[PDB]
């Protein structure tokens, strides 16, 4: 699982892969780790597939019962204190890394990263999942803050594609959605139209010369591809 | 243990404490931890008193035996190689952390040997249990090309960070200066903990303990 | 701890040591191993020092509340059954206590023994503790029912002593009581080192 | 994570004919570091005539000092202002250590006070409340240094000599300084400065004393 | 440990007694098995333990005393020389491949002057031993479960000047206490004695 | 533990021109007394007296290897062994068996016959050399002896008044230890004589 | 998420407290831009070494206690010695419930001259000194803080107590793995608690014994 | 549950629910017991010779202990519940004290149950 | 530890940090993980500081005894089969990740990566150490093969600096050396002249707004920096 959420001027861009894998076997290759809480507030979802699904639909029922009694819109800081309350009083029993990102008219675009420990940190961009450790040095070099909506979509799709190329846990589709003052626009690009893959990376075309022919010199001349020559 | 070392302008200065404890009680208060290796090489030691003394005397007799053959002054890099191959081939069972200092024709050589067998050649090293508290004094006040007096006081002020803060260390500062020509070993250089309130000396007269038999054997 | 008490023609004599050790360190040397419950009962202590001094203080409270309500003395068959029902109720709670109760009720004497597991036995001759196994062999050799009052005090003081001399967990000051029909009296209280130069001069 | 931790230090007391001297060094330390050198939380006052002097774990020490503090106050409110004696406090201590027997305190206690007659008596406790009245007592990490030392010079045993007269407050105080200057030499978890409390019938006087800093 | 060995020395004799019980975890195999091995004409050892190492230790000790009398022209060694040879075999076996001997034994003997130049020990000898290799010369020694019952019995009643009959009725008290308190059924005790005329098998006390 | 299986405490103090050494008399198996009249001291010559504590099987086996090596030293070298040579000899014996180690803790006391300097040494079970100038002590009551010896010692003691301090230190520490006691056997030794004293103790 | 070492010292007039602005997760340094110095009420401030989720719930609790006692009633604000006492009894309550607040904390506070400096552990230990350090600053930085309080018993001024914290934060960057060179310093004085803008220290890496040919193992 | 206070005080210091419970006994069957030197006799009224009652003779005086027996007067349904509390108390006593229960002990228990129903809600 | 070796046309560029750390404490902050075997063949050195030092000077004595008996130059493939032989027959007892890179006149610049398992793979660039997992997605995006010698030095110094900014195990100096047909040129740039650090990264200047002032609205207005305001 590689999940991330990046803020721009208008709102936020949620990004995630699509694969639940029982250790080493792909149980599902079209998962949806972008969970709707309210219309403009979603959450990314990593870790245990059952422990985080039960939290996401328990928060989303407190959060819709709140919205009816208030009669107004729900702030993102409200939804991020319902995950922190539940991920802290269950922190020894669940495995839950949650990234809460959304839009509210008061504060604009907000990103909250709630790790497995149960803390809450408000950010500009957040990373999560087992594939997130590849993306710290990728965002230190290639990420500049203050992009547009069209640039954050193509960046976060290029960000996830570098993550599941090296990670074995992550893979599949790339599901992204933007949350701002307009309608929430979702987009799912496949594997075969992904912006990066190592199989078509032109520097991994040459095989590593392991299987040397039996020869008279120490001059390395590539692999042995035939029984005759 | 709070053994340290410092490279100064011409030579090295080795430092140590004197406390030796066997299981939360102070066994000895004036143990000696700066050992002899060569006329130009000394060696501090931490860990177990059995393993430190027996790795040092074996190598220091091997360096002496190798000195009669060559007829030359012994290198500190060959003192280090004999220590690191012994401590590696027992795989950390010989629990001795070492600080090795010396002077050769190539200049001062200060390096440490871990109990697993790894070596680090640095301008200043600390080993033992109070090595963390003694390093913070060295990281705050070391500079290149210090005099013999400024390095002897920097070493002694780093031992007292292990005396007054580490419970496994104390009671004195041992300082050994290694030069190209001579080598000076002082034991009572800094005794910050003196004897406060000298003893009442409860007097018992000779004969007040009841004795059942006694046998006197003249010589 | 070595602790014995025996029953004979004339009452019950209780004899104990006074030593409490935490493994190889001796904590104290003046421990009262006999908690007198009231002026006609006794109770000894062996095993855990706090487990005994708590529940024999609870036992001394249930014996005093018996006399307040029912207007008469408690028997010894009811006094141990209070201590045995308490002990059996906490048999899985890791208690370590082995106690004898001794007293003169209206049916003569009776000498019982309560485990830390809820047992209660009725004999005329016990010896409890870690050094009890030394106190049996010198007592079973010289015990008989019709001993005199002075000789049974001598046999009890001498049987504790040979256990304190051999066991590392026993020693100190040998305390001998005597339970007659009017209650109990402290017979003697003497050091074990002074008692060595009497029995082997 | 383990919920028990030994914080060093030692406490010793020697009781006289109408006084007790009560001492305990001021040194707090943890895993391998040294937390403080000035902790006064080792000897606690319950009544003007009876103190408690405990050591071991510093966290369960402060909890036991407060539950002892308010059971004395419910005693004072329910008895018409009558202050509890040493014998009443030290049996209160012996019961509360057994009420928490299965999740106990990691403290080792001494209740130190005067009698109803005026004589001083010190008590000692294990982790579960084994009490005994006695004339002195030494707890802590340096107990095995000092408790054999107090056996040799207070009891006056194994010495074929006549008995000295009764010890004053000054000769007891100078004796007890020889133990803490002896425990500061040979115990690594003991000794920065020891605070002496002298409990007499006309109030309490308080002194301090300097030990070795290493 | 289920079977006891009781031995005490006096002015001119050494009593030994060893219960002849052999069991299989609760089942009495025997009741009369001799566990007091006659090493020499004036020396014997009362080993306790299971029957595996007990025979194989005593046969190694006995055949080496006899071999040391073959090679030394029939000269009987002292009791301390036999006892120090025994604990050498206990102490070298706790640091070996095969493991420690699980035997607890009491060595007993009488020292006679082998020639006119011998001015050594004249009296009796009694040595406490252990499975580790502890050796201690002792006035009386005991092993087994009933050892602590009878060691404090011999604290009460043993005297250095006991006669052959007074120590015979003392050993009868030693055997009747083990029958009284020990749960392990020791009914037959094999009392032997070492005197100046050799060993003798006492029939009366059992 | 294996080290406190047999019981017994041996200590030694250093004086002006003398030293003392003193052991208890108990042998045991973890609670029960096996013997009441067994010392732990050994004398090899008129200058060196050493005491062993720990496991009694190792207390006798190691002391046989020492006597095998001390008497072989006197046949090869035509002289008595000295204190610094004897202490450095059985330091090497406890280090050869470092992974199969002996369970002894030798307490060595020695003196120069011609010079008059005392030399104390107490190694660990793995042979850690340590020479204090004041006192050494090992055994089951060793933690009780560091309090008794350090609060009562002074450097300038006569042989008659050094015995009185070492005797009151052994007995007061054995009244708190349940694996040591039953009297004590001491040995004061000067340049001129060796005096061996047996001390009254509690029979508890 | 876990915090690093926190050091603090008293001077003539107030208390200083420094801490790096890093929140690591194991070895990974996730966020170098979060503030750890929370200030309590109007006279005090706390900072923690250990779990951040335990500190974020504990400091939320003890901040609600200061305001609601002050808002509801006509009482004064709690002193630093009384809100540290509530901080101590709340951590000890959690370990007796077998769910502790797994972090060391450093507490500072100044109320009209009376300066307060104390720390508290997850177990319930509390101590007061003129120099508190938690984490690996208790091993590294705390020996340097102790000698500079005893080389002048009259007291440190603010200028010389700021030199030695910078000398201690510099060695924490040298010798602690889970640390960065970005530090905030709280300053509790008679005016109140004031947290500074993040700064860095000047590090020296230019020794002639650190060169490639000397440290080589050929 | 239902625990409204029923047994309350009159304006003259009387308990109405106790004085009206004594009137239910004064209509009950008469039972007389006297005390001798070696024997105790108790005789009850045994309502009538109904001729329709069972030939199996029905005892009115109920057995409570091995030596302690009881006879009542009042409501015969309330007394059966009272005795099965006292027959349960004898087996509580010789399970915690190993003794035969005294006569004065059992009466202090039954009088303790009578008083406990005069100071309860809903009772 | 973050070690890497990158090939260009002439030879190779070795790059490493300088820090040996006993778990959590920096024992040495000026380590040298670039070990000389012969004049033109070095090895990077990760894992156990003692187990890899004993291998590096045991190979370097077999390799210099070979060079004297041959009378010619040592190939890099020769030196990489002496580490593979030793890291495989000791693989349960040591902890050793070795990157062997060098120069020989026959094959030019060679890079061999020998992991902890004991395998040998000939590469174009290699990564190693605990800090190497940050650099896979950094080399997938920012690395183009075929750079010059001056460009591979500034790249590998920029590569290590992104690695020890996130890694806690790695840090200190950056020691680089180039091995080609010229003399071996070494270079050690410090921390305070490193090409990247997060403390001077201009997007981590704004603190994450955690410590909100006690206010009347949900409008997030930054941290609370003073007791008065
Ligand atoms: C009818 C009868 N026949 C016998 C033979 C017994 C008997 O022995 N009953 C008994 C019951 C409960 C106990 F708890 C004990 C008991 N006594 C002790 N004394 C000393 C130590 C000790 N002291 C110091 C250090 C280490 C230890 C182990 C331990 N215990 N345990 C003994 O009862
Ligand atoms: B992602 O791989 O972490 C994913 C996130 C989930 C919330 C949709 N989790 C899973 O794939 C988990 C396994 C896992 C992998 C790595 C870390 C933690 C957990 N999958 C399952 O829990 C699972 C397995 N089998 C059946 C159903 N669900
Ligand atoms: B260091 O603490 O001064 C010291 C090293 C020197 C004496 C070789 N260590 C000791 O004091 C050791 C114990 C130890 C403590 C902490 C870490 C490792 C080892 N003491 C002894 O080895 C010892 C024991 N008995 C007598 C003499 N020395
Ligand atoms: B005797 O040794 O059994 C004695 C009797 C008791 C009434 C004083 N008991 C103890 O000495 C026990 C030994 C023990 C038995 C079982 C478990 C643990 C310990 N010691 C104590 O209880 C003790 C502990 N600390 C102080 C005093 N006593
Ligand atoms: B690097 O951090 O992996 C480094 C490589 C070494 C070959 C120079 N290793 C170390 O720092 C090791 C610890 C380690 C960290 C991470 C993975 C594996 C090992 N250091 C030591 O082995 C060490 C520790 N203390 C003293 C001496 N050496």
Q: Quick one: chain C helix, strand, coil %, rounded to 5? A: 35, 35, 30
C75 is catalytic: no
Measure C89 CA to nearest chain D CA, in Å: 16
- Report the relative pairing of strands B173-178 and B11-16 from DSSP bridges: antiparallel
Taking alpha carbons only, the member of F157, F143, F147, F142 closest to residue D178 is F147
CA distance E123 to E13: 9
Instruction: Select the residue of C25, C172, C196 nearest F177 (Cβ to Cβ).
Output: C25
CA distance E205 to E169: 8
Taking alpha carbons only, the member of D155, D108, D122 closest to residue D10 is D108
Across A128-154, b (16+ Cβ under 10 Å) vs e yields bbbbbbbbbbbbbebbeeebeeeebbe
Question: Kind and range of the H or E element at E166?
Answer: helix E166-181
Helix (H, G, I), strand (E, B) or coil at I19: coil
Among the atoms of ligand 3, which is closest to the Cα of residue B3?
3
CA distance C42 to C32: 12
The residues near I193 (Cβ < 8 Å, ≥ 6 apart) are: none
CA distance F194 to F200: 20
Can you list the alpha helix ranges (DSSP code H) found in G10-132? 52-72, 80-96
Question: CB distance D213–B197 less than 8 Å?
Answer: no
G128 interfaces chain D, CB cutoff of 8 Å: yes
C26 interfaces chain F, CB cutoff of 8 Å: yes
CA distance I27 to I50: 14
Q: How many CB atoms lie within 10 A of CB G35?
A: 20
Please report, in angstroms and rounded to a whole number, the separation of the first and last CA atoms in chain C.
Answer: 26
Counting every residue written for chain F, the total comes to 204
Method: cryo-EM
Radius of gyration of chain A (CA): 21
Please work out whether the CB of residue I48 comes within 6 Å of at least one atom of ligand 5: yes
Please work out whether the CB of residue C119 comes within 6 Å of at least one atom of ligand 1: no
In the C/E pair of chains, how many CB contacts fall below 8 A?
42
- For chain C, give the residues followed by a break (C–N over 2.5 Å): none
Phi, psi of B41 (to 5 degrees): -125, 130
Q: How many CB atoms lie within 10 A of CB F150?
A: 21
Residue C62, burial from CB neighbour count under 10 angstroms (0-12, 13-18, 19+)? middle
Helix (H, G, I), strand (E, B) or coil at C153: helix
Own/partner pairs, I85-90, CB within 8 angstroms, 24+ separation = I86/I55, I86/I58, I86/I59, I87/I55, I87/I114, I87/I116, I87/I118, I88/I118, I90/I51, I90/I55
Find residue A107's DSSP bridge partners: none
**Domain residue ranges of chain E, discontinuous segments joined by +:** 1-206
CA distance A102 to A37: 10
Q: Quick check: I107 and I122 in contact, CB under 8 A? A: no
Phi, psi of I113 (to 5 degrees): -105, 120
CA distance A216 to A203: 30
CA atoms within 13 A on the CB side of C198: 11
Among the atoms of ligand 2, which is closest to the Cα of residue A50?
22
CA distance A181 to A190: 27
The residues near G105 (Cβ < 8 Å, ≥ 6 apart) are: G46, G47, G48, G49, G55, G87, G119, G120, G121, G134
Q: Quick check: H83 and H70 in contact, CB under 8 A? A: yes
Q: What is the DSSP letter of I78?
A: H
Q: How many CB atoms lie within 10 A of CB C33?
A: 24
Using alpha carbons only, what angle is made at residue G4 by residues G2 and G6, rounded to the nearest 5 degrees?
135
CA distance C9 to C148: 8
Q: Quick check: C151 and C30 in contact, CB under 8 A? A: no
CA distance E205 to E17: 9
Q: Quick check: A102 and A63 in contact, CB under 8 A? A: no
What is the token pair recorded at F4? 């406190």
- Chain B residue with the nearest C-alpha to that of D158: B209
- Give the CA distances from residue I99 to residues I45, I46, I132, I163, in Å, rounded to whole numbers and listed in that order: 7, 8, 12, 17
- Give the CA distances from residue F121 to residues B58, B79, C109, F133, I138, in Å, rounded to whole numbers and listed in that order: 21, 29, 62, 9, 63
Ligand nearest to the CA of I1: 5
Q: Which domain range does residue C108 map to?
A: 1-201
CA distance E166 to E169: 5
The total number of structural domains in chain C stands at 1
D15: alpha, beta or left, given left = phi > 0 and alpha = psi -120 to 50?
A: beta
Q: How many CB atoms lie within 10 A of CB G123?
A: 24
Q: How many CB atoms lie within 10 A of CB D168?
A: 12
Q: How many helices and strands (H and E) does chain B possess? A: 4, 13
Which residues of chain F are within 8 Å of residue E148 when distances are taken between CB atoms? Answer: 32
Taking alpha carbons only, the member of B118, B140, B128 closest to residue B33 is B128
Q: Which domain range does residue D39 map to?
A: 1-214
CA distance C194 to C171: 12
Measure C111 CA to nearest chain E CA, in Å: 19
Which residues of chain A are within 8 Å of residue I201 when distances are taken between CB atoms? Answer: 140
CA atoms within 13 A on the CB side of C98: 14
Instruction: Give the strand order in the sheet containing G6-11.
Output: G131-134, G6-11, G14-20, G183-188, G193-195
Q: Which of F25, F87, F128, F183 to mutate to test the interface with B (most CBs of B within 10 A)?
A: F128
Phi, psi of B19 (to 5 degrees): -75, 135
Instruction: Select the residue of C138, C158, C165 nearest E153 (Cβ to Cβ).
Output: C138
CA distance D37 to D184: 13
What is the token pair recorded at B103? 């002077």
The residues near E66 (Cβ < 8 Å, ≥ 6 apart) are: none
What is the token pair recorded at E85? 């040879």
The residues near D208 (Cβ < 8 Å, ≥ 6 apart) are: D193, D194, D195, D196
Distance from chain centroid for Cα C14: 5
Taking alpha carbons only, the member of C39, C18, C37, C38 closest to residue C28 is C18
Q: Quick check: F125 and B23 in contact, CB under 8 A? A: no
Phi, psi of I65 (to 5 degrees): -75, -30
Q: How many CB atoms lie within 10 A of CB E66?
A: 11
CA distance B19 to G218: 37
Q: Quick check: G47 and G6 in contact, CB under 8 A? A: yes
Question: CB distance I220–A162 less than 8 Å?
Answer: no
Taking alpha carbons only, the member of A191, A149, A185, A179 closest to residue A26 is A191
CA distance B16 to B30: 11
Q: Which domain range does residue B75 map to?
A: 1-219
3-state secondary structure string, B88-140? HCCCCCCCEEEEEEEEECCEEEEEEECCCCCEEECCEEEECCCHHHHHHHHHH
Distance from chain centroid for Cα G214: 39
Compute, in degrees rounded to 10, the torsion defined by CA atoms A136, A139, A141, A145: -150
Q: Quick one: chain A helix, strand, coil %, rounded to 5? A: 25, 25, 45
Q: How many CB atoms lie within 10 A of CB C143?
A: 16
3-state secondary structure string, chain F? CCCCCCCCEEEEEECCCEEEEEEECCEEECCEEEECCCCCEEECCCCCEEECCECHHHHHHHHHHHHHHHHHHHHHCCCCCCHHHHHHHHHHHHHHCCCCCCCECCEEEEECCCCCCEEEEECCCCCCCCCCCCEEEEECCHHHHHHHHHCCCCCCCCHHHHHHHHHHHHHHHHCCECCCCCCEEEEEEECCEEEEEEECCCCC
Is it the case that chain C and chain F have 3 or more CB pairs lying under 8 Å apart?
yes
Q: Quick check: G180 and I199 in contact, CB under 8 A? A: yes
Q: Quick check: A157 and A13 in contact, CB under 8 A? A: no
Find residue I13's DSSP bridge partners: I6, I178
- Give the CA distances from residue A35 to residues A85, A98, A175, C147, D46, in Å, rounded to whole numbers and listed in that order: 18, 10, 11, 92, 60
Distance E124 CA to ligand 3 centre (A): 50
Phi, psi of D87 (to 5 degrees): -70, -30
Q: Quick check: B141 and B130 in contact, CB under 8 A? A: no
Distance A189 CA to ligand 2 centre (A): 21
Question: Kind and range of the H or E element at I86?
Answer: helix I76-88
Taking alpha carbons only, the member of H11, H69, H77 closest to residue H44 is H69
CA distance E172 to H112: 64
Q: Quick one: chain B helix, strand, coil %, rounded to 5? A: 30, 35, 40
CA distance C81 to H95: 9
- Give the CA distances from residue I65 to residues C113, D87, F84, G217, in Å, rounded to whole numbers and listed in that order: 85, 86, 47, 18
Distance from chain centroid for Cα G108: 8
What is the token pair recorded at A26? 């792909």
CA distance A195 to C123: 93
Where would I find the beta strands (DSSP E) of E20-139?
22-24, 27-30, 36-38, 43-48, 104-110, 124-129, 135-137
Own/partner pairs, A203-209, CB within 8 angstroms, 24+ separation = A203/I124, A203/I143, A203/I144, A203/I145, A206/I124, A208/I121, A208/I122, A208/I123, A209/I122
C162 interfaces chain E, CB cutoff of 8 Å: yes
Question: CB distance D130–C54 less than 8 Å?
Answer: no
The residues near A162 (Cβ < 8 Å, ≥ 6 apart) are: A134, A135, A138, A196, I137, I140, I141
What is the token pair recorded at E153? 């019995």
The binding-site residues of ligand 3, defined as CB within 6 angstroms of any ligand atom, are B 1, 17, 19-22, 27-28, 31, 33, 45-49, 52, 128-129, 168-169; F 124, 128, 130
CA distance F5 to F22: 20
Find residue C26's DSSP bridge partners: C21
Q: What is the DSSP letter of G140?
A: T
Q: How many helices and strands (H and E) does chain H possess? A: 3, 4
What is the token pair recorded at B146? 């210090």
Sign of dihedral through CA atoms B55, B56, B62, B66?
positive
CA distance D188 to B169: 9
Taking alpha carbons only, the member of C164, C109, C101, C107 closest to residue C131 is C164
Phi, psi of F144 (to 5 degrees): -80, -20
CA distance G198 to G183: 5
Taking alpha carbons only, the member of I131, I103, I117, I126 closest to residue I38 is I103
Q: Which chains touch E (3 or more CB pairs under 8 A)?
A: C, F
Measure C72 CA to nearest chain H CA, in Å: 11
Q: How many CB atoms lie within 10 A of CB D194?
A: 28
CA atoms within 13 A on the CB side of G62: 26
The total number of structural domains in chain B stands at 1
Phi, psi of H83 (to 5 degrees): -75, -35
CA distance D60 to D55: 9
């Amino acid at each position: 699982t590689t999940i991330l959420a990046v803020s721009y001027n208008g709102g936020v861009v949620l990004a995630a892969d699509s694969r639940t894998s029982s250790g080493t076997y792909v149980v599902n290759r079209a998962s949806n780790k972008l969970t709707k809480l309210t219309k403009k507030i979603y959450c990314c979802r990593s870790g245990s597939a059952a422990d985080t699904q039960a939290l996401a639909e328990r928060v989303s029922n407190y959060l819709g019962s709140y919205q009816t009694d208030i009669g107004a819109g729900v702030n993102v800081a409200t939804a991020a204190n319902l995950f922190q309350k539940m991920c802290y009083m269950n922190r020894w029993n669940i495995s839950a890394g949650i990234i809460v990102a959304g839009y509210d008219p008061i504060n604009g675009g907000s990103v909250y990263s709630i790790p497995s420990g149960g803390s809450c940190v408000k950010l500009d961009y957040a990373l999560g999942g087992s594939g997130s450790i590849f993306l710290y040095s990728f965002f230190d070099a290639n990420y500049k803050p203050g992009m547009s909506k069209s640039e954050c979509v193509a960046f976060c799709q290029r960000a996830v594609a570098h993550a599941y190329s090296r990670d074995g846990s992550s893979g599949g589709l790339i599901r992204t959605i933007t949350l701002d003052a307009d309608e929430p626009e979702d987009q799912t690009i496949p594997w075969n139209r992904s912006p990066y893959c190592m199989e078509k990376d032109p520097k991994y075309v040459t095989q590593a010369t392991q299987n040397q022919p039996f020869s008279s010199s120490a001059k390395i001349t590539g692999n042995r591809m035939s029984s005759t020559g | 243990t709070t053994i340290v070392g410092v490279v100064y302008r011409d030579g090295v200065v080795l430092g140590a404490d004197t406390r030796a404890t066997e299981g939360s009680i102070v066994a000895d208060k004036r143990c000696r931890k700066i050992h002899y290796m060569a006329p130009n090489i000394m060696c501090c030691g931490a860990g177990t008193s059995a393993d430190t003394e027996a790795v040092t005397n074996m190598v220091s007799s091997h360096l002496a035996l190798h000195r009669l053959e060559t007829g030359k002054q012994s290198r500190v890099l060959e003192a280090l190689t004999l220590l690191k191959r012994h401590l590696y081939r027992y795989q950390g069972h010989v629990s001795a952390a070492l600080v090795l200092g010396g002077v050769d024709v190539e200049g001062p050589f200060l390096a440490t040997i871990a109990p697993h067998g790894s070596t680090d050649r640095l301008p200043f090293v600390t080993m033992g249990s109070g090595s963390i508290a003694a390093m913070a004094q060295l990281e705050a006040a070391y500079k290149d090309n210090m005099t013999c007096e400024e390095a002897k006081e920097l070493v002694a002020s780093a031992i007292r960070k292990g005396i007054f803060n580490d419970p496994y260390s104390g009671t004195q500062v041992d300082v050994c200066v290694i030069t190209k020509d001579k080598t000076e070993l002082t034991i009572g250089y800094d005794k910050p903990n003196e004897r406060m309130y000298p003893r009442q000396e409860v007097l018992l007269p000779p004969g007040t303990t009841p004795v059942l038999k006694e046998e006197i054997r003249q010589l | 701890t070595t602790t014995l008490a025996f029953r004979f023609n004339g009452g019950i004599i209780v004899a104990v040591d006074s030593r409490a050790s935490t493994g190889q360190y001796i904590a104290s040397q003046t421990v009262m191993k006999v908690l007198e419950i009231n002026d006609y009962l006794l109770g000894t202590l062996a095993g855990g020092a706090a487990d005994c001094q708590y529940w024999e203080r609870v036992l001394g409270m249930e014996c005093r509340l018996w006399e307040l309500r029912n207007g008469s003395r408690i028997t010894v068959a009811a006094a141990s059954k209070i201590l045995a029902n308490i002990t059996y109720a906490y048999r899985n709670h890791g208690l370590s206590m082995g106690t004898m109760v001794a007293g003169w009720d209206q049916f003569g004497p009776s000498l019982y023994y309560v485990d830390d597991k809820g047992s209660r036995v009725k004999q005329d001759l016990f010896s409890v503790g870690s050094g009890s196994i030394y106190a049996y062999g010198v007592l079973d050799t010289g015990y008989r029912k019709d001993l005199s009052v002075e000789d049974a005090c001598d046999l009890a003081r001498r049987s504790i002593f040979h256990a304190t001399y051999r066991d590392g967990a026993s020693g100190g000051i040998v305390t001998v009581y005597h339970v007659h029909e009017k209650g109990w009296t402290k017979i003697s209280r003497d050091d074990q080192t002074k008692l060595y130069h009497r029995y082997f001069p | 994570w383990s919920p028990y931790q030994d914080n060093g230090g030692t406490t010793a007391a020697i009781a006289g004919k109408d006084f007790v001297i009560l001492a305990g060094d001021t040194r707090l330390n943890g895993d391998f570091c040294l937390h403080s050198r000035h902790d006064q939380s080792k000897i606690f006052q319950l009544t003007p005539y009876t103190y408690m002097a405990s050591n071991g774990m510093q966290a369960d020490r402060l909890q036991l000092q407060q539950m002892l503090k308010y059971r004395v106050k419910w005693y004072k409110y329910n008895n018409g202002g009558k202050v509890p004696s040493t014998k009443a406090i030290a049996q209160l201590m012996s019961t509360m250590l057994y009420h928490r027997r299965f999740f106990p305190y990691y403290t080792f206690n001494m209740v130190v006070g005067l009698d109803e007659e005026g004589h001083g008596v010190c008590y000692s406790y294990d982790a579960v409340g084994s009490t005994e009245p006695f004339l002195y007592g030494t707890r802590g990490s340096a107990a095995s240094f000092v408790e054999p030392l107090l056996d040799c010079l207070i009891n006056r045993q194994h010495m074929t000599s006549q008995a000295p007269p009764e010890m004053t407050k000054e000769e007891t105080l100078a004796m007890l300084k020889n133990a803490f200057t002896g425990a500061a030499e040979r115990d690594i978890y003991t000794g920065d400065s020891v605070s002496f409390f002298i409990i007499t019938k006309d109030g309490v006087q308080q002194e301090s004393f300097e030990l070795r800093k290493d | 440990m289920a079977e006891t060995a009781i031995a005490f020395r006096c002015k001119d004799y050494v009593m030994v007694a060893a219960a002849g019980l052999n069991a299989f975890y609760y089942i009495k195999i025997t009741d009369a098995e001799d566990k007091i091995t006659q090493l020499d004409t004036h020396q014997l050892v009362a080993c306790t333990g299971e029957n595996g190492p007990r025979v194989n230790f005593t046969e190694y000790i006995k055949c080496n005393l006899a071999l040391n009398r073959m090679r030394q022209h029939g000269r009987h060694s002292s009791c301390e020389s036999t006892a120090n040879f025994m604990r050498n075999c206990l102490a070298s076996a706790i640091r070996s491949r095969e493991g420690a001997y699980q035997v607890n034994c009491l060595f007993a003997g009488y020292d006679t002057p082998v020639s006119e130049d011998d001015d050594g020990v004249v009296g009796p000898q009694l040595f406490y031993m252990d499975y580790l290799g502890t050796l201690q010369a002792v006035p009386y020694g005991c092993h087994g479960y009933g050892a602590c019952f009878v060691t404090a019995l011999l604290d009460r009643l043993w005297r250095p000047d006991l006669s052959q009959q007074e120590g015979l009725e003392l050993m009868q008290k030693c055997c009747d206490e083990v029958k009284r308190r020990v749960i392990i059924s020791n009914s037959y005790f094999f009392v032997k004695a070492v005197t100046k005329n050799g060993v003798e098998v006492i029939t009366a006390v059992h | 533990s294996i080290m406190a299986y047999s019981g017994g405490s041996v200590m030694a103090m250093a004086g002006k021109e003398c030293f003392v050494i003193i052991s208890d008399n108990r042998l045991g198996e973890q609670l029960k007394t096996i013997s009441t009249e067994v010392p732990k001291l050994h004398v090899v010559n008129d200058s060196i007296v050493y005491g062993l504590t720990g496991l009694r099987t190792d207390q006798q086996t190691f002391a046989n290897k020492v006597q095998f090596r001390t008497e072989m030293y006197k046949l090869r070298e035509e002289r008595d062994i000295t204190g610094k040579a004897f202490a450095a000899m059985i330091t090497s014996m406890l280090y050869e068996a470092r992974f199969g180690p002996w369970f002894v803790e030798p307490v060595i006391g020695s003196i120069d016959k011609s010079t008059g300097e005392v030399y104390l040494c107490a190694t660990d079970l793995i042979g850690a050399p340590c020479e204090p100038e004041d006192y050494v002590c090992a055994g089951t009551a060793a933690e009780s002896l560091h309090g008794m010896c350090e609060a009562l010692w002074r450097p300038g003691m006569s042989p008659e008044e050094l015995f009185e301090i070492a005797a009151q230190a052994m007995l007061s520490a054995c009244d708190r230890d349940s694996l040591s006691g039953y009297g004590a056997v001491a040995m004061i030794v000067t340049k001129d004589k060796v005096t061996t004293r047996l001390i009254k103790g509690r029979k508890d | 998420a876990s915090g690093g070492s926190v050091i603090a010292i008293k001077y003539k007039g107030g208390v200083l407290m420094a801490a790096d602005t890093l929140l690591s997760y194991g070895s990974l340094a996730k966020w170098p831009n979060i503030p750890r110095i929370r200030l309590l009420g109007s006279h005090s401030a706390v900072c923690a070494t250990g779990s951040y989720a335990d500190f974020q719930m504990m400091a939320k609790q003890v901040e609600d206690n200061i305001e609601r006692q002050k808002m509801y009633h006509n009482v004064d604000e709690l002193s630093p010695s009384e809100v540290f006492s509530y901080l101590h009894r709340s951590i000890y309550q959690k370990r007796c419930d077998f769910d502790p607040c797994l972090c060391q904390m450093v507490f500072i506070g100044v109320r009209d001259g009376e300066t307060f400096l104390a720390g508290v552990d997850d177990v319930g230990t509390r101590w007061e000194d003129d120099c508190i350090a938690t984490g690996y600053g208790a091993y590294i930085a705390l020996p340097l803080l102790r000698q500079a309080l005893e080389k002048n018993p009259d007291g440190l001024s603010r200028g010389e107590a700021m030199r030695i914290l910078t000398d201690c934060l510099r060695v924490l960057f040298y010798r602690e793995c889970r640390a960065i060179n970005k530090f905030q310093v709280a300053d509790a004085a008679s005016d109140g608690v004031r947290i500074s803008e993040p700064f860095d220290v000047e590090t020296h890496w230019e020794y002639e014994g650190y060169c490639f040919e000397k440290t080589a193992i050929i | 549950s239902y625990d409204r206070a029923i047994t309350v005080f009159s304006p003259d210091g009387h308990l109405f629910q106790v004085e009206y419970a004594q009137e239910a006994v004064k209509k009950g069957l008469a039972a007389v017991g006297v005390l001798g030197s070696d024997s105790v006799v108790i005789a009850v009224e045994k309502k009538s010779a109904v001729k329709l009652q069972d030939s199996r003779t029905i005892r009115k005086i109920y057995k409570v202990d091995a030596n302690i027996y009881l006879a009542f007067a009042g409501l015969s349904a309330d007394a059966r519940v009272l005795i099965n509390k006292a027959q349960l108390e004898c087996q509580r006593f010789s399970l915690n004290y190993e003794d035969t229960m005294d006569v004065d002990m059992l009466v202090r228990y039954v009088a303790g149950v009578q008083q406990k129903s005069t100071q309860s809600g809903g009772s």
